[PDB]
Design a protein around this ligand. Structure first.
Ligand SMILES: O[C@@H]1[C@@H](O)[C@H](O[C@@H]2CO[C@@H](O)[C@H](O)[C@H]2O)OC[C@H]1O
Ligand SMILES: O[C@@H]1[C@@H](O)[C@H](O[C@@H]2CO[C@@H](O)[C@H](O)[C@H]2O)OC[C@H]1O
Ligand SMILES: O[C@@H]1[C@@H](O)[C@H](O[C@@H]2CO[C@@H](O)[C@H](O)[C@H]2O)OC[C@H]1O
Ligand SMILES: [Ca+2]
Ligand SMILES: [Ca+2]
Ligand SMILES: [Ca+2]
Lengths: 533, 533, 533
């Protein structure tokens, strides 16, 4: 029935929520705006985007945020007639500190106007709100130890949240230090039977990733660990197509069945490479997958063993599939950009991105460069398949080399490639390739750039991705296409390639316009095409 | 019965050879002279050094060799009334190449004058000589592939060796590519029942290490792999005290039992550290362990699952214990230096190291610095326990800062610490500390060096090693000791700490004298003590 | 008249020697064998090589020597009817130490059998022998300070050399600490007027290089510095074609004229580059130039300022031109090799390099990779011009990818390029490009290798160098040439590009053959062509 991953491309830290016979997953969005993506399902198999809750500056202001900062794992729950969303804005993602702030927002409906944030704490990321049977609410998060002689993951801290007072109350207490796997985060609490079950993520979000579960009769512990822990992990299964299985949440379905959503990375093909030396590169980033649970001796178990199964049986419900929610060829005739498009860190107002200036086109007024953590005129969507074609059609008249417009495949500010239109002193309006690898820039088509003739209004830019490699191509008529003679490698746009390890997103493809001269020169994009191949 | 490791401290690549009821293990020695250690046992439990075969420059000329170059995995066998020892002198240990040459030497007895080398080939390291039931001989080794977009371990080459012609004959053929573990080396062949069994090391000599075994009716294959491969590995057993289990050889006893010797690394205590993030630091280098095999369906299995056991049951023989073969406190009264002492790269003649010049003393005439791959007046023995004291008592009168004498804990030319006597312009004869970490030198007693009174003939130098840390101390009278207020970390002298990854030896403790001026100044060492705990 | 440089290409540290009206310049050769290159002139304008004195293993044993180790600045003098050559063998060229030994060899003639070496000291490099007017002989050299808190160049040490005893006698003493430029080496003593004069190299052998002169009535000092020091430097003159001026030696000619030879680097074109940011790359390495001296107030001065002049006025003699000492196209018809080809570290015997085994061809028997500091089957000559073509015609039949033969542009073991013949599993015998940039290897023609058909017996290999860039080209007939579509860059084979700063030689061009398999496969080189363009 259900093939994994259920959410493909960039979809980490899945937090699942049941409301009656409705099902929701919220995933982390990091530096991409708006914050948080919530998907809905009736059968746990088919999923559609229904909410992007953190869409106001008052809720989320990520200007300047480092790559892989911002919205880390979110927590979605429902209680007392409303949804509760807990989220972090992480400001520091390298070194001894992980400075970041936890906030609560609520809404009556999944896609309404969510509240302005209530500040919770800053002690660590992976905040989760637990609603206990007595009406009392509790926040769990990881507690961060910055000290040099110390492992940073100090364990799971718990504190009561007062809905009345709109603040944490009493004293924070450590309830669980984790197992020897350490890197203990992603805590979620469940009152099942006579027990509080504490689900955590351990071993880090790379190849040693795991989901650990423990249980106690006291909310404050101590928690005895699952006798066959890890509950879930891909570490001992180097040939499993689904790696990095961890950061899970549990769902007890209305049909009295149990499932476990978790993140996973799907490495590119690795034939002829040493199985264990390096375990792979994931351009799709961390995706969402689902597993069935079964119960033995007051403990949950993953069906099929503690590794992730590629395919599982769904709950005992009627299949409810969803109509496609984007046009493969999006001609920009809508009044609002399709919801699979995101922007970097900030919302882009009509002064930067507009569907109104020239009907049927997305107009991007040129802002800062592809290396900027501030204001980029960039509108992008996820890679959601290993095999796809993405394509745009743009009219652009750059009068200086400080101006550019193109199709970009982007991981972060220091890691991207692009086929762009720019201006050159002798050659005039030109097409070039530009790549950035850990801030180091290459122009592989120097000085051999494609001269664009004066009488061409639109340049058509395309990328074809084929798993390990991809290629750019262009047309001046949309019919006769010419490949650019550089073969690019998809692993360079993957989490695993990034030297900082603050690499928690995934590859995007989008439309960019830079104007470094500050003359407000703009690009008109007639369509954006994304098509699985 | 048998507790592992059986060869403690730096003892990798164990090649076991049975002759009647005598058992011999040859281990690799790399840059340390002389080349190869051969231990003897009657019972596979108690082992005694009996041979150091590569002890002439005609056999082994390693001056200038890189750290962890020189004598890699050796192979010891017995056939046609003599011992055959195959060895490599590896010259290049970093980069796309691994330039290194294979040699055969023979001797009628284990501890006699071995022959001058017969040059075999250079196609790759881990050479092994197979003696076939029909009286024909074949060489196997790994085949190196230097190419940019190619895994270096091209598989296992085989070629016949002509005993009469003192050379390899026919054409060389690849008989085995390996499993998806790759990094296929350490090939050994055995004719058992109807099959040729080919044993290889795979996964590389760090934590992914494994012994792989395959069989064929044809010497030239194709070889079918063991259905439950690896034969041996520590990889899935992160809590196992014995890690890096691989590079094995098989012994069939005279009692009709089966064992497998293999190398292993014992990480320093890691309490509080993530189990899988980094799997540890091994200052004792790679040690030799032994596992019991049994046979099932024409395949050998390691008794106790495919991970290494700490304690096994030895063969059905009477125990033969050996007397201690070194003095805890070596007073240097003998005519030859104890065989646990080695020198770097080359033999030191009486002009450099002598027990004759000053009765009851080892005299070292100062040569080059601790960073020299050429001529060092350095006499050193292995760290063989996690807890020990080592101590010397030295008479030395430096006239310049270019001269030093001291006690050194040493991994390689670029990684070592020392408590040494030298000379200062203002202070004169001083005792100081010096460290070198990846060539970076520090002097922790900078400006507060211990002034040695002129009326002091002997400075006593001590290191106390307690697992993760160690501490130097000194005395002028040999009864009253003073700690130097610096705590050192043993992990900095471990395989795993070395950035070059050409890190194949282990920590040594020894006596050193430098004379950077060339005035042939010398240090007289009255004794050298080594004591567990 | 005399246009600089006089010795183009790799010719650093010139030591000039007058014999009546004959003039000799010795230069450092570092890892290139045989050691030291002496030139001869009558006019100071025209120079032919006459002697390569250190050509027995007894005098110079450099196998395993680090790149830019071996023979540093040499000292040539004449006294009591014999030549005197003082040289170092430097073993350690990185870190806190510079382990190295100073030797003396003598000869009745320039080109005879120089004696076996007399060991002097090891206290530091740049040794220099001073023959005092009273028959005593004194050695000066730099004194090395290894200490972390200290500047390495401790000053100039002086000790007397007893000719009869063939050793240094008395106590060594520092006679000069240097100026604020520091890095004080290259000491040369001259007794002129009533004063002893001390000439030193200061500021390092890069763009801060300078020649410093001082004087003292006494031999032990204190020496007072030239009131307009430096005597020679290119530091304050960034637009000067001749950079890095220093490490001088004085000649007083029979026509009562004073001249100063020195090393110099000539940076590649730097048009449109910032003047002072990086001062350039010198692929021809450090070359030899001459400047004229005058006298004022007992101090020597360089004519035209303390900056080097591109052209000078030579001595008052009749021009003695020399016959070209090498063939433009060298068909290898002689029974020994042209004295302009050197070997790496060691002499190459008949078993590796031979002109005897094949009439009219240089047979190179394949040995270790281009990254080996041990046994390379490699015969090479200096780049000596910015514009040239080198070329060879090679017969080679590789049976494996482990075998290579070709045309190499080489700086050291880790920085080189080649066009070479090798074997491929599918494509058979092939032509390929290979680069090595600080050990990182590229193959710019991967899957685009030239298939060499089996009816071709000779492949033609050509490099064409044009200042900043160079190209390789091949031919099967020697008439129709095809450029391989890669433009290489000359600055990557310069002294200044080497990250380690132990970069003291220069670009070389040569013929290589590797046999990684150890089968003694061989390349026959029909001719080698060096031709200025
Ligand atoms: O919210 C999630 C985090 O819980 C997760 O935790 C760790 C952050 O530091 C990294 O070095 C570790 O590898 C990682 O496990 O990071 C991912 C984020 O989605
Ligand atoms: O002879 C032994 C070899 O079998 C082995 O070689 C490999 C060298 O590179 C490393 O990355 C691999 O891990 C290692 O297996 O170890 C060296 C020597 O002991
Ligand atoms: O023999 C010559 C040296 O005297 C000379 O001087 C210095 C050697 O150490 C390096 O760190 C400095 O940069 C250099 O100036 O250069 C080498 C040799 O030609
Ligand atoms: Ca449109
Ligand atoms: Ca004694
Ligand atoms: Ca010829």
């Amino acid at each position: 029935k259900i093939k994994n991953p259920i959410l493909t491309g960039f979809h980490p830290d899945p937090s699942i929520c049941r409301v009656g016979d409705d099902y929701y997953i919220a995933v982390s969005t990091f530096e991409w705006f708006p914050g948080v993506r919530i998907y809905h399902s009736k059968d746990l198999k088919n999923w559609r985007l229904v909410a992007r809750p953190l869409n106001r500056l008052s809720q989320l202001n990520m200007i300047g945020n480092p790559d892989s900062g911002g919205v880390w794992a979110p927590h979605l729950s429902y209680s007392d007639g409303k949804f509760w969303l807990i989220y972090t804005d992480v400001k520091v993602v390298e070194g001894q500190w992980k400075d970041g702030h936890n906030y609560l927002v609520t809404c009556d409906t999944i896609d309404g106007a969510w509240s302005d944030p209530i500040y919770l704490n800053s002690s660590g990321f992976d905040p989760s709100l637990f609603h206990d049977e007595d009406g009392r609410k509790y926040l769990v998060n990881m507690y961060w130890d910055h000290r040099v002689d110390h492992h940073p993951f100090y364990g799971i801290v718990l504190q009561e949240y007062s809905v009345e007072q709109k603040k944490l109350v009493g004293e924070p207490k450590i309830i669980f230090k984790g197992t020897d796997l350490r890197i203990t985060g992603g805590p979620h609490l469940y009152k099942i039977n006579g027990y509080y079950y504490l689900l955590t993520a351990e071993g880090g979000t790379r190849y040693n990733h795991a989901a650990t579960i423990a249980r106690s009769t006291s909310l404050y512990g101590p928690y005895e660990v699952h006798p066959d822990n890890p509950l879930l992990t891909s570490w001992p299964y180097p040939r499993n197509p689904l790696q990095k299985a961890g950061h899970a949440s549990i769902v007890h379905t209305h049909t009295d069945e149990w499932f476990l959503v978790h993140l996973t990375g799907r490495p590119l093909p690795r034939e002829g490479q040493p199985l264990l030396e390096h375990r792979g590169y994931c351009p799709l980033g961390r995706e969402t997958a689902i597993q069935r649970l079964e119960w033995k001796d007051g403990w949950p178990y993953v069906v099929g063993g503690n590794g992730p199964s590629l395919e599982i049986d769904g709950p005992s419900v009627e299949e409810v599939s969803w109509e496609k929610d984007y046009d493969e060829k999006d001609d920009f005739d809508g009044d609002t950009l399709n919801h699979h498009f995101q922007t970097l860190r900030i919302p882009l107002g009509e002064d930067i991105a507009t569907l109104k200036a020239r009907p049927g086109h997305l107009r991007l007024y040129g802002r800062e460069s592809l290396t900027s953590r501030f204001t980029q005129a960039f509108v992008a969507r996820r890679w959601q398949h290993f095999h796809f074609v993405a394509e745009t059609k743009v009219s652009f008249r750059p009068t200086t080399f400080q101006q550019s417009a193109g199709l970009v495949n982007y991981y972060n500010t220091q890691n991207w490639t692009t086929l762009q239109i720019t201006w050159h002193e002798e050659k005039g309006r030109i097409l070039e390739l530009m790549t950035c690898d850990h801030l180091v820039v290459d122009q592989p088509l120097r000085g051999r750039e494609i001269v664009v003739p004066d009488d061409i209004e639109y340049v058509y830019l395309r990328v074809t991705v084929q798993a390990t490699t991809y290629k750019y191509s262009y047309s001046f008529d949309g019919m006769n296409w010419i490949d650019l003679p550089v073969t690019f490698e998809s692993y360079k746009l993957s989490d695993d390639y990034i030297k900082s390890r603050a690499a928690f997103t995934g590859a995007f493809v989008g439309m960019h316009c830079r104007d470094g001269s500050g003359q407000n020169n703009y690009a008109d994009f007639d369509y954006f095409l994304y098509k699985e191949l």
